[PDB]
Amino acid sequence: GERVQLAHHFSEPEITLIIFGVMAGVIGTILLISYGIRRL
Amino acid sequence: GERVQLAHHFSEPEITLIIFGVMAGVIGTILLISYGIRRL
Amino acid sequence: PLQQTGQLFGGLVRDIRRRYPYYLSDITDAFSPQVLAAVIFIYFAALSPAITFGGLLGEKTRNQMGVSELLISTAVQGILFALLGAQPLLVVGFSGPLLVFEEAFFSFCETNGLEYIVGRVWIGFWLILLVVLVVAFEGSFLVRFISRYTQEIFSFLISLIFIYETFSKLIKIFQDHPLQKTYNYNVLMVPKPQGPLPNTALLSLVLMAGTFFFAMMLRKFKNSSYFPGKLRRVIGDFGVPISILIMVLVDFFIQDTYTQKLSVPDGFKVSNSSARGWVIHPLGLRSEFPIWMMFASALPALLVFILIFLESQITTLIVSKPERKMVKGSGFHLDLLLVVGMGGVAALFGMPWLSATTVRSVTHANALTVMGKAQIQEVKEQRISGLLVAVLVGLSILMEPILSRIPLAVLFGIFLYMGVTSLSGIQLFDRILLLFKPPKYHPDVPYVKRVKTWRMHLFTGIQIICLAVLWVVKSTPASLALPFVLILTVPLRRVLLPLIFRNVELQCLDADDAKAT
Amino acid sequence: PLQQTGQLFGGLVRDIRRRYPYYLSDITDAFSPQVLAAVIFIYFAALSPAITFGGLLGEKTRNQMGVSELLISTAVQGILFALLGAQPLLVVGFSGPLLVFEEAFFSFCETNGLEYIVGRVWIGFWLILLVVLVVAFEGSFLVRFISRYTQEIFSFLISLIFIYETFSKLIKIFQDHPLQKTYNYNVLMVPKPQGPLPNTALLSLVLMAGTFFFAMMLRKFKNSSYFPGKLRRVIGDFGVPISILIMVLVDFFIQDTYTQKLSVPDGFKVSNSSARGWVIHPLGLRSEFPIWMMFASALPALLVFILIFLESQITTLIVSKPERKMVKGSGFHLDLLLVVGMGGVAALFGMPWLSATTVRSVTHANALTVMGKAQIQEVKEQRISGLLVAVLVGLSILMEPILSRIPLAVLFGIFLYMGVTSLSGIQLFDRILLLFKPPKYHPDVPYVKRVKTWRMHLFTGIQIICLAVLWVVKSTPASLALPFVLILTVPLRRVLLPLIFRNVELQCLDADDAKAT
Ligand SMILES: CCCCCCCC(=O)OC[C@H](COP(=O)(O)O[C@@H]1[C@H](O)[C@H](O)[C@@H](OP(=O)(O)O)[C@H](OP(=O)(O)O)[C@H]1O)OC(=O)CCCCCCC
Ligand SMILES: CCCCCCCC(=O)OC[C@H](COP(=O)(O)O[C@@H]1[C@H](O)[C@H](O)[C@@H](OP(=O)(O)O)[C@H](OP(=O)(O)O)[C@H]1O)OC(=O)CCCCCCC
Ligand SMILES: *[C@@H]1O[C@H](CO)[C@@H](O[C@@H]2O[C@H](CO)[C@@H](O)[C@H](O)[C@H]2NC(C)=O)[C@H](O)[C@H]1NC(C)=O
Ligand SMILES: *[C@@H]1O[C@H](CO)[C@@H](O[C@@H]2O[C@H](CO)[C@@H](O)[C@H](O)[C@H]2NC(C)=O)[C@H](O)[C@H]1NC(C)=O
Ligand SMILES: CC(C)CCC[C@@H](C)[C@H]1CC[C@H]2[C@@H]3CC=C4C[C@@H](O)CC[C@]4(C)[C@H]3CC[C@]12C
Ligand SMILES: CC(C)CCC[C@@H](C)[C@H]1CC[C@H]2[C@@H]3CC=C4C[C@@H](O)CC[C@]4(C)[C@H]3CC[C@]12C
């Protein structure tokens, strides 16, 4: 980073991987729900 | 005229009348000569 | 292109199936001098808004986002869009609504003790989720309900705003260096002159007017009957580069008088190294980013998604009209995905999200448009021009010794040319001109020969009221509501207009392909 | 008109019989707004050369003849010519060659210790003799040997010189007030600024360009399809007055910057009251005028007669072309008599002799020309417009508060408009433009469809050689030999051209009425 930055438990790659993983889970849940609807 | 002007024997109208009369005489002489030619 | 398949990401797959087969032609069709002249034109047309908006953004956000971030984001997103996009003729860059949103969000973060750049990171994170879902469910099929009505209202409004801002820049130049009887001959010049200077405003006016005059004259000369046709068309294609060169030389040979020049940053470095780095931690830089703002970022993400979606999709509608002779296809789903996803990713680097700007894209399409023996014959649909424009924008920092000698007034004349020439294909501008003509001089078009004159004038006047309403909204603090007021025109055409116009009148006046019903 | 009757004063009598029946129409035909717009146009077009040439004349002759003398001579001769001439559309005034002759004669009198004004009186005395003899013997029938060749060479050269002088005036403005980094804010302004001033030259260029722009745009608007036709034609008629008014208002609302304004003398008085009065004695003012110079004044009188004769008769030929739709007739013998006799009489009063100026008269004819629905429909032939122009020139001293707020730069733009619009009827200019067009774009005219393209270009380039030779003569001390070099084009057309061109080619190219051989 720049100057002095607060130290977090997750680093930038770790935190962005976590965020992208949660986003992918949300997208997959939405797509599976849409797949379940319009069929029954 | 203006300022101090040289004194002439003829004033401005007199001299311009003399000059116009001379010019008219010359023009009339030329026209009468032209009338004489192209006839004999 | 706007049909709904019903299959997840079906619209995305169709757009790639439509345009990527032409990828080989997208490289070979660029081998013409008109493409190079378009590169030189759109380079300045894209660099100058980048520099101006970067300066304004750095002023308004304490340089947390500035010129260098904007230039790098513009270059990278333009390169990736030209390499992968389905409508390569779009020009991707920063815009006025995005600047207003950045101002509002910085003010909000200042009020609530939030880090503005980390908030932007989370807005970008929510933007990726939105555009994936919209593309997944073919949400870009809703663009089919934006008829020529809304398209032309938006296009005419954006062109008018562009011309107004171009003239206001010259007005500001005249205000900063007014015509005075006496001047203080000892004025500090760094960073900018601290007082009025002689000859500056008048020379700026002369440069702008001369650039506009030369551009219009060479545009006329292109269609003229002078010179061999090949040489004439070559000079006509290079009309804007030749005008810029002539006026830049004129200013270069006038040494004593000061004129404002282009100014790029020294190097590829963050505008404030004391604030942030190249990568912003989503959890915070100085303070911990609160959890509630991680979820509350969806609403600004919704607003930014709406702004980018409306701007880019309407621009794609305008540039891909059937009457512009675009025979290669455009992808509404793929371009939306690329633009919004690239913006969301760029937010992670503290770099701006971009949009398909209307004036720049229309100017790019017109510069690549070939005119036959009048009538549009073809368009040089290729990916090399946009890629080269983006590359030159990225290299703008390194070519400072050249950009530092180009006055802003010359670029103002170029902007005036862009604004006036962006009005050619708009039927609203044509019908406004019919208000000032006798009815016997009206052209043989379906909306003249099949519609009564006062009925057509009433239809045009209703659009002018929409233009005034949208213009008022922009000039208010609620200028981020402009996309919604523009959206309101779609019910106006589809619900209210049939109450006062017949179907044949509406088909003649609002036709997707300029047809006679 | 150009036939020789063989009776003394036959052409003079025929001109009186041809035109004076139309005298009632020559007054009633001026009841239209177009004539008023023409009056406003030609008033400035005649006043500004009068002031400029009078100032130069006073500088070069120590104010023996100056601005007031030229204004009074212009007014009186214009009134008399409009009331009595057989071509009232001619504008009578001072020209460059007359100024050159005045310079040379003043230098001659200075070298020999002769009174310059008395020598002018005797030159005017000999001028009356020459014109009476020429009119008596119908000497104006030699104008029939001046074909479209010599007419168009003369007209194109005079238009080129007019445009060049208009641009050189702006160059002189820039030289007087150069663009500098620093100026001395304390500069004495009376009588004229004694040092460079800021913002002056650039504003002068802006005013000139704006006046030219508005004039050309209003001329285009006249032929346009906008507005009701009657209002559109009225606004197009007043295009030059409207442009002058707009730019004068623009300069008026700029208080701080200096621009050079129109300057007329305080009253109707001689420029140098210590040199001469209103009436100059033919025999001498201070010293007795020598008798030998009374007879030796014939040679300068012959030179002046040749200058005035060629200028006036070629102007009458150009304005009264059969293609310009003049259906009222023109008198070559009467107009020459009036102009030269009035010049001789004005010599007696220390006033300049004048000539039928080319650009001024062509501008006067074009301002009164009515266009069809492209095609010249008719001409507002009348005596009122020239009479009113001369009356306003005479009253220009009394309306100093109006003229003192009119910049010369606005008049420079009007002069540029006059120069560019004076090229419309010249086929030499049309063929010069065909040197830069493909032959497939050449118009359907007899000299194109009946002559090979390279033959027409050879004929055109021969005329360009004549133009270059004439231009070289103008830029030499022997510029008074220009009429003789111009007359030499008549042997070139009637002798040397048939050696390299066929009869049919010459008939198609050099045609008296633009007919297909
Ligand atoms: C600097 C250029 C070279 C200078 C050397 C000067 C020597 C020189 O250049 O002559 C060759 C050429 C003559 O050949 P040519 O008249 O046949 O050339 C035609 C011309 O190019 C047209 O523009 C073309 O139509 P378009 O536009 O495509 O619709 C037409 O093609 P097409 O469509 O009918 O099949 C061409 O045939 O020049 C000229 O064009 C005349 C104007 C020259 C003006 C003089 C140059 C200013
Ligand atoms: C400020 C003026 C007040 C305007 C009040 C606004 C109300 C208003 O003025 O319209 C009514 C009237 C319509 O009447 P109309 O169309 O019949 O008038 C025709 C028109 O004047 C043409 O120019 C004429 O042809 P040209 O040119 O000679 O060849 C033609 O004469 P003709 O030869 O065919 O027999 C005329 O018939 O005017 C307009 O022309 C529309 C222009 C609207 C534009 C008005 C924009 C201000
Ligand atoms: C870079 O960022 C720092 C900190 O964000 C800015 O320093 C601030 O400057 C403003 C303007 O006076 C004031 O709030 C304080 O002086 C500073 N605050 C803090 C917290 O440091 C600095 O101005 C920025 N640099 C630029 C060029 O804008
Ligand atoms: C008016 O005319 C007089 C002479 O008639 C001029 O006076 C002369 O000025 C020149 C210029 O220096 C010199 O020859 C003498 O100083 C004067 N000579 C005589 C005989 O008077 C006077 O300059 C003229 N006025 C103007 C404004 O030029
Ligand atoms: C739509 C995009 C932005 C993802 C959705 C955001 C929500 C659902 C998720 C994504 C990543 C998540 C965070 C990941 C890491 C941590 C650090 C931990 O000590 C507290 C919870 C916290 C702070 C999570 C809170 C909820 C969170 C912000
Ligand atoms: C064509 C016009 C100018 C006429 C030609 C000029 C000749 C023929 C005439 C015109 C007027 C004449 C002058 C009239 C009066 C006088 C005064 C006299 O004491 C001496 C001779 C003198 C000075 C004359 C000399 C000749 C003269 C100059």
CA angle D261, D262, D265 (to 5 degrees): 130
What is the SS3 string spanning D103-139? HHHHHHHHHHCCCHHHHHHHHHHHHHHHHHHHHHCCH
Q: Residues D437, D399: one domain? A: no
Percent of residues in chain C assigned helix, strand, coil, to nearest 5: 65, 5, 35
Q: Do C183 and D205 touch (CB under 8 A)?
A: no
**Partners of C355 in the β-ladder:** C93
Alpha carbon B13 to chain centroid, angstroms: 12
Which residues in chain B have their CB less than 8 angstroms from residue D284's CB? 6, 8
> What is the distance between the alpha carbons of residues D133 and C210, in angstroms, rounded to a whole number?
56
> What is the distance between the alpha carbons of residues D65 and D56, in angstroms, rounded to a whole number?
10
Q: Do B6 and D287 touch (CB under 8 A)?
A: yes
Q: Do B3 and D284 touch (CB under 8 A)?
A: no
The number of distinct structural domains making up chain D is 2
Burial class of C89 by CB neighbour count within 10 A (0 to 12, 13 to 18, 19+): buried
Neighbours of D476 (CB within 10 A): 10
Residue D62 C-alpha to ligand 4 middle, in angstroms? 7
Q: Which ligand is located closest to the Cα atom of residue A30?
A: 5
Q: Residues D337, D484: one domain? A: no
Integer CA distances (angstroms), C510 to C142, C431, C507, D7, in order: 18, 12, 5, 78
* Contact assessment for residue C316 and residue C68, using Cβ atoms and an 8 Å cutoff: no
* Contact assessment for residue C355 and residue C29, using Cβ atoms and an 8 Å cutoff: no
Ligand 5 site-directed mutation target among C128, C133, C292, C294, most atoms within 8 Å of CB: C294
DSSP letters for C76-128: HHHHHHHHH-S-TT-EEE--HHHHHHHHHHHHHHHHTT--HHHHHHHHHHHHH
Residue D348 C-alpha to ligand 4 middle, in angstroms? 22
> What is the distance between the alpha carbons of residues D446 and B5, in angstroms, rounded to a whole number?
66
Integer CA distances (angstroms), C291 to B18, C118, C345, D69, in order: 118, 12, 20, 93
Which residues in chain A have their CB less than 8 angstroms from residue C270's CB? 2
- Dmax (CA) for chain B in angstroms is 57
Residue C481 has phi, psi (to 5 degrees) of -85, 0
Q: Among C351, C381, C400, which residue terminates a domain? A: C400
Q: Running DSSP on this structure, what letter comes out for residue C356?
A: E
Which residue, by CA, sits nearest to atom 5 of ligand 5?
Answer: A23
**Which atom, in ligand 2's list, is nearest to the CA of D227?**
44
Nearest to D262 by CA among D60, D413, D397: D397
Neighbours of D347 (CB within 10 A): 28
CA angle D116, D117, D122 (to 5 degrees): 100
Closest residue in A to C280 (Cα–Cα): A1
**Partners of D356 in the β-ladder:** D92
Q: Do C281 and A8 touch (CB under 8 A)?
A: yes
* Contact assessment for residue C451 and residue C502, using Cβ atoms and an 8 Å cutoff: no
Domain span including residue C29: 10-156+265-400
Amino acid at C58: G
Ligand 3 site-directed mutation target among C57, C62, C285, most atoms within 8 Å of CB: C62
Residue C433 CB–ligand 2 contact under 6 Å: no
Which residue, by CA, sits nearest to atom 28 of ligand 3?
Answer: C62
Q: Which ligand is located closest to the Cα atom of residue C225?
A: 1
Ligand 4 site-directed mutation target among D114, D274, D285, most atoms within 8 Å of CB: D274
Q: Residues C465, C324: one domain? A: no
> What is the distance between the alpha carbons of residues B33 and B39, in angstroms, rounded to a whole number?
11
Listed in sequence order, the DSSP H helices in D353-494 are 358-367, 384-394, 400-403, 408-421, 427-434, 446-449, 453-474, 482-487, 489-491
* Contact assessment for residue D42 and residue D389, using Cβ atoms and an 8 Å cutoff: yes
> What is the distance between the alpha carbons of residues D431 and D441, in angstroms, rounded to a whole number?
12
Q: Residues C343, C476: one domain? A: no
Residue D371 CB–ligand 2 contact under 6 Å: no
Q: Residues C96, C18: one domain? A: yes
Classify residue C237: in a domain, yes or no: no
Residue C288 C-alpha to ligand 5 middle, in angstroms? 13
Q: Residues C145, C109: one domain? A: yes
> What is the distance between the alpha carbons of residues C468 and C156, in angstroms, rounded to a whole number?
11
Alpha carbon C87 to chain centroid, angstroms: 15
Classify residue C412: in a domain, yes or no: no
Chains B and D share 3 or more Cβ pairs within 8 Å:
yes
Suggest the residue from B12, B14, B38 to mutate for an interface test with chain D (most D CBs closer than 10 A).
Answer: B12
Q: Residues C396, C441: one domain? A: no
Closest residue in B to D287 (Cα–Cα): B6
C285 min Cα distance to partner chain A (Å): 5
3-state secondary structure (DSSP) of residue D304: helix
CA angle D56, D58, D63 (to 5 degrees): 175
What is the SS3 string spanning D158-206? HHHHHHHHHHHHHHHHHHHCCCCCCCCCCCCCCCCCCCCCCCHHHHHHH
Q: Which residues have a Cβ under 8 Å from the Cβ of D234 and sit 6 or more positions away?
A: D33
Classify residue D495: in a domain, yes or no: yes
Which residues in chain D have their CB less than 8 angstroms from residue C185's CB? 181-183, 185
Classify residue D194: in a domain, yes or no: no
Burial class of D213 by CB neighbour count within 10 A (0 to 12, 13 to 18, 19+): middle
Ligand 6 site-directed mutation target among D133, D289, D291, most atoms within 8 Å of CB: D291
3-state secondary structure (DSSP) of residue C287: coil
Q: Residues D344, D273: one domain? A: yes
Which residue, by CA, sits nearest to atom 1 of ligand 4?
Answer: D272
> What is the distance between the alpha carbons of residues D474 and C414, in angstroms, rounded to a whole number?
41
Which residues in chain C have their CB less than 8 angstroms from residue A8's CB? 281, 283-284, 288
H/E element, D320:
none
Q: Which residues have a Cβ under 8 Å from the Cβ of C419 and sit 6 or more positions away?
A: C159, C162, C163, C166, C359
Classify residue C208: in a domain, yes or no: no
User: What chains are in contact with B, requiring at least 3 Cβ pairs below 8 Å?
Assistant: D
**Which atom, in ligand 3's list, is nearest to the CA of C58?**
28
Q: Residues D274, D380: one domain? A: yes
Residue D66 has phi, psi (to 5 degrees) of -140, -150
Q: Among C383, C400, C417, which residue terminates a domain? A: C400
D185 min Cα distance to partner chain C (Å): 5
Q: Does C253 touch chain D (CB under 8 A)?
A: no
User: What chains are in contact with D, requiring at least 3 Cβ pairs below 8 Å?
Assistant: B, C
Residue C164 C-alpha to ligand 4 middle, in angstroms? 60
Using the Cα atoms of residue D355, residue D358, residue D362 and residue D363 in order, give the sign of their dihedral: negative
Classify residue D482: in a domain, yes or no: yes
Residue of C132, C133, C277 with shortest CB distance to A1? C277
* Contact assessment for residue C26 and residue C383, using Cβ atoms and an 8 Å cutoff: yes
Nearest to C429 by CA among C147, C159, C90, C212: C159
* Contact assessment for residue C335 and residue C316, using Cβ atoms and an 8 Å cutoff: yes
Residue D354 CB–ligand 4 contact under 6 Å: no
Neighbours of C455 (CB within 10 A): 16
Q: Does A34 touch chain C (CB under 8 A)?
A: yes
Residue D297 C-alpha to ligand 6 middle, in angstroms? 12
Q: Do C227 and D436 touch (CB under 8 A)?
A: yes
Q: For D47, how many CA atoms within 13 A lie in the half-sphere containing its CB? A: 29
Classify residue C502: in a domain, yes or no: yes
**Partners of D93 in the β-ladder:** D355
Suggest the residue from C179, C442, C444 to mutate for an interface test with chain D (most D CBs closer than 10 A).
Answer: C179
Resolution (A): 3.0
Q: Residues D478, D346: one domain? A: no
> What is the distance between the alpha carbons of residues C229 and B21, in angstroms, rounded to a whole number?
72
* Contact assessment for residue C357 and residue C53, using Cβ atoms and an 8 Å cutoff: no
Residue of C125, C129, C285 with shortest CB distance to A1? C285
Q: Residues C466, C383: one domain? A: no
Q: Residues D321, D385: one domain? A: yes
3-state secondary structure (DSSP) of residue D93: strand
Neighbours of D495 (CB within 10 A): 9
Residue C229 C-alpha to ligand 1 middle, in angstroms? 6
Q: Does B26 touch chain D (CB under 8 A)?
A: yes
Q: Which residues have a Cβ under 8 Å from the Cβ of C174 and sit 6 or more positions away?
A: C201, C204, C205
Residue D320 CB–ligand 4 contact under 6 Å: no
Closest residue in C to A17 (Cα–Cα): C282
> What is the distance between the alpha carbons of residues B23 and D126, in angstroms, rounded to a whole number?
9
